[PDB]
Design an enzyme around this catalytic site. Structure first.
Site, PDB file in Angstrom:
ATOM      1  N   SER A 174      -8.469   8.590  51.874  1.00  0.00           N
ATOM      2  CA  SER A 174      -8.102   8.623  53.287  1.00  0.00           C
ATOM      3  C   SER A 174      -6.614   8.770  53.510  1.00  0.00           C
ATOM      4  CB  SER A 174      -8.568   7.348  53.976  1.00  0.00           C
ATOM      5  OG  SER A 174      -9.955   7.131  53.791  1.00  0.00           O
TER       6      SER A 174
ATOM      7  N   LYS B 144      -9.132   0.308  61.105  1.00  0.00           N
ATOM      8  CA  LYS B 144      -7.855   0.986  61.058  1.00  0.00           C
ATOM      9  C   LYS B 144      -7.141   0.907  62.397  1.00  0.00           C
ATOM     10  CE  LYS B 144      -8.906   4.373  57.493  1.00  0.00           C
ATOM     11  NZ  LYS B 144      -9.009   5.829  57.273  1.00  0.00           N
TER      12      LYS B 144
END
Lengths: 189, 100
Positions: A96, A139
């Site tokens: 990611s 996140k």
């Protein structure tokens, strides 16, 4: 945020976090002014294998984009470079961080510090088509409290950012993109 | 399978709109679908129309169904730093390949 560093979201095994990513020169840049020998990367951060893979492909895309964009510059083709990716990301989430690397390097190759407090994420491919990444909720909620104001995310995940409770999203502006050449025109206005 | 679960969810959130809901006759139509299923989970069909230099669509027989993986290749350094030289260009392969 001096040259050659960028903050980046990461889905830690317990909630989110906002670990930085950093870069540095490692040998004098003109020990062979005409030398044809590669600017080898030297990653550190106690990586796994998939991280080595993503780092290499991201390095290649950076080295390609720059010769496509600013031909006279050659700092990156021939200059040994240490790169530091802090450990802590959950291994499934490990790709990611890829997009951050690709801008990290470019900053060092042009000398412009990134725009202030602009976190980013998302996977990259050899041609720069960003791909979806999971765990967006941890996140976002983690990046909210670091002072970030302008998040940017892959365009293929946007629906998940428009389903979280509205109060979490108030404040920070968001961008969305699909081809990486757009982000290079955000971070360096 | 996934189509099964989603059709079941549509009927269920439809049923909730009868026991108390104003409507006594649900009729899903494409415009209305959002209310029962939310925003689409996919929009792209293939990852894109081919980039001019270096890719070709590749079918592959993954463990569950077929799939249309893309092979992608690119240059790694300027090509002609020394036209007269002789050091053949190595590949660097990626993708966690096994030896075969």
């Amino acid at each position: 945020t001096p040259p050659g560093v960028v903050m980046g979201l990461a889905w830690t095994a317990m909630g989110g976090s906002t670990l930085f990513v950093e870069t540095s020169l490692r040998r004098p840049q003109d020990k062979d002014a005409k030398g044809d020998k590669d600017g080898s990367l030297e990653v550190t951060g106690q990586l796994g294998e998939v991280m080595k893979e993503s780092a290499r492909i991201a390095y290649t895309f950076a080295r390609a984009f720059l010769m496509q964009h600013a031909p006279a510059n050659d700092y990156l083709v021939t200059s040994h470079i240490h790169l530091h990716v802090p450990e802590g990301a959950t291994p499934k989430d490990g790709p990611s961080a890829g997009c951050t690397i690709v801008t990290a390097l470019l900053s060092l190759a042009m000398g412009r510090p990134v725009r202030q407090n602009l976190a980013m994420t998302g996977e990259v491919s050899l041609t720069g088509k960003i791909l979806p990444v999971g765990g967006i909720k941890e996140k976002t909620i983690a990046a909210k409290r670091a002072g970030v104001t302008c998040i940017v995310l892959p365009a293929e995940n946007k629906k998940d950012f428009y389903d979280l409770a509205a109060f979490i999203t108030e404040g920070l502006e968001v961008h969305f993109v699909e081809h990486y050449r757009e982000i290079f025109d955000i971070a360096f206005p | 399978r996934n189509l099964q679960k989603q059709v079941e969810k549509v009927l269920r959130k439809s049923a909730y709109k009868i026991v108390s809901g104003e409507a006594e006759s649900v009729e899903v139509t494409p415009e209305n679908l959002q209310d029962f299923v939310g925003k689409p989970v996919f929009t792209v069909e293939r990852m894109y129309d081919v980039t001019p230099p270096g890719v070709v669509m590749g079918l592959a027989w993954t463990a569950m169904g077929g799939s249309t993986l893309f092979v992608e290749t690119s240059l790694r350094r300027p090509q002609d730093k020394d036209a007269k030289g002789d050091k053949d260009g190595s590949l660097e392969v990626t993708g966690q390949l096994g030896e075969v």
